[PDB]
Design a protein around this nucleic acid. Structure first.
Length: 533
RNA sequence: GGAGUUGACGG
């Protein structure tokens, strides 16, 4: 990097910080990329100029992008594993992806992908394990699949969407290039594969590839035995022992979670029996492995498996809540619903784990709303509430699930919730997790008289509730469930705060759906229209 | 327009 090179790329950078329209902008972007020929590694890895080279790549036309990828392909793994050049490699890929929807570019993108996949597949294992290169590889696998849109779920992150699925709450791409690239990533010795399993960044790469092969059974049946080192699909006794001992490892545990999420039926069952079938509780108490069990539970196929999971885990619900593993319980409860097995056994086991004595069972709701305060407190026989405290996210999720069982199985839950005193019920609705418990109860098949009894204890608080963004949903769901007398009561309370309510994000919608303006001006006509529903 | 598990990731 000489001063004429720095000067020139600085001067291009400063020209775009204006005076130059987009049609000229992209021809300048390409004439400048030609100034990188023979210097691609030096420019792309420079801590300053690499940022300009990103701008050029995201601003040039297809022919010059592909020319840059063809010229730098022999140094592309080195660029991709540099802390600055990896954003350059990803910028080349993001820019390539913008031409996906152009039918006239299919073979020109494929040729570019091929230059890249060829140089990577020739030597992949340090790029897979490199903290920068594994981001480039994850993006590259997505592009070969025709996904151009960053999904934190594909790149390995948590979200609320995956949590819903676990709890029950498209471009053709370049198929042969995805298969070719991924065969290159997995064609190493079984001994190399054993350390890919437990390295953070190669695990993240294989997670992305697995998620992209979702529902490609013919391919998933070739890939997963390779990743698990066991080449009908069969896991031998010693391989199953090795899989099981790596299962508490941070990186591997994330990988088996995704294997369980995409595994075909034949392969799920073999892993259930040969790997997990008598270690479910021991894995459920591990920092890392318990999420594998959550993934195992969520994807069970038949009722025989439910019974096995029930036997090993349900006597141990209390341990799982005590030891911070509420998500294992939540997953077991949620799948008994979909498999239609052990529903009542699951509801009764959860009560028995939170309430030892017959007397304490009226308190199942508060103790589950505040799971961590109840199990964490000094004296449990005199624990009642946690005033002002934020309620427990997973406790409340468990309860959202509980209230989708038939009412026959959840009577201790309906009685406990509907008999909480008004101060506790209003506190629950004002809490962003607690309002979801209430709303799940309002949508349950509990009786109307039982729903109305809870709604009536909220009287005097619908105004304050409506101002909360979250509480505004509870007000509406209560209103819908009510008779004319309480509909008119809620309207009066919302009417006393119409000024504040209109100045909030959800206020306008709430004043419209309940028609609070028409209640104030023409109360006779509002009562008539409300009675017809 | 809603709280979102207890264990990871970049110049």
């Amino acid at each position: 990097i000489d001063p004429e090179t720095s000067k020139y790329f600085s001067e291009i950078a400063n020209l775009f910080d204006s005076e130059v329209e987009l049609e000229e902008r992209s021809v300048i972007c390409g004439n400048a990329l030609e100034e990188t020929r023979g210097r691609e590694y030096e420019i792309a890895t420079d801590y300053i100029i690499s940022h300009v080279l990103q701008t050029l790549l995201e601003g040039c036309e297809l022919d010059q992008l592909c020319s840059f990828i063809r010229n730098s392909a022999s140094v592309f793994p080195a660029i991709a594993m540099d802390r600055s050049g990896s954003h350059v490699a990803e910028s080349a890929l993001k820019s390539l992806a913008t031409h996906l929807e152009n039918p006239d570019a299919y073979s020109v993108i494929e040729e570019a992908l091929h230059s890249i996949c060829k140089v990577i597949v020739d030597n992949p294992l340090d790029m897979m394990c490199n903290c920068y290169g594994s981001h480039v590889l994850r993006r590259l696998l997505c592009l070969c699949k025709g996904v151009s849109l960053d999904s934190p779920e594909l790149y390995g992150a948590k979200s609320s969407k995956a949590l819903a699925k676990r709890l029950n709450l498209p471009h053709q791409g370049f198929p042969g290039m995805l298969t070719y690239l991924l065969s290159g990533l997995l064609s190493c010795s079984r001994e190399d594969m054993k350390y890919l399993q437990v390295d953070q960044y190669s695990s993240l790469v294989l997670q992305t590839a697995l998620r992209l092969m979702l529902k490609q059974d013919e391919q998933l049946l070739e890939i997963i035995p390779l990743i698990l080192r066991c080449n009908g699909f069969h896991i031998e006794t010693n391989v199953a022992k090795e899989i099981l001992e790596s299962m508490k490892d941070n990186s591997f545990s994330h990988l088996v979670e995704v294997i369980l999420e995409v595994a075909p039926e034949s392969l799920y069952n073999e892993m259930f029996n040969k790997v997990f079938k008598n270690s479910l509780f021991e894995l459920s108490v591990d920092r890392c492995a318990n999420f594998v069990i959550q993934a195992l539970i969520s994807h069970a196929r038949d009722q025989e498996q439910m019974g096995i999971m029930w036997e090993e885990l349900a006597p141990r619900f209390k341990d799982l809540l005590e030891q911070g593993k509420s998500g294992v319980v939540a997953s077991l409860i949620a799948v008994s619903q979909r498999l239609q097995s052990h529903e009542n056994k699951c509801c009764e086991a959860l009560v028995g784990a939170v309430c030892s004595t017959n007397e304490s069972r009226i308190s199942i709701l508060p103790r589950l709303l505040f799971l961590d305060y109840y199990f964490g407190c000094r004296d449990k026989s005199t624990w009642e509430w946690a005033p002002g405290a934020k309620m427990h996210v997973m406790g409340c999720l468990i309860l959202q699930g509980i209230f989708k069982f038939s009412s026959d199985h959840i009577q201790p839950y309906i009685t406990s919730l509907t008999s909480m005193k008004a101060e506790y019920i209003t506190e629950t609705a004002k809490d962003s997790s607690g309002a979801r418990v209430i709303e799940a109860f309002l949508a349950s098949d509990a009786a109307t008289k039982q729903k109305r009894r809870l709604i009536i204890k909220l009287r005097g608080h619908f105004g304050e509730l409506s101002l909360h963004t979250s509480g505004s949903f509870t007000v509406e769901k209560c209103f819908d469930a009510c008779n004319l007398t309480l509909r008119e009561a809620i309207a009066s309370e919302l009417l006393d705060v119409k000024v504040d309510l209109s100045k909030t994000k959800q206020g306008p919608y709430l004043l419209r759906k309940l028609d609070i303006d028409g209640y104030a001006s023409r109360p006779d006509q509002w009562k008539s229209r409300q009675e017809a529903k």
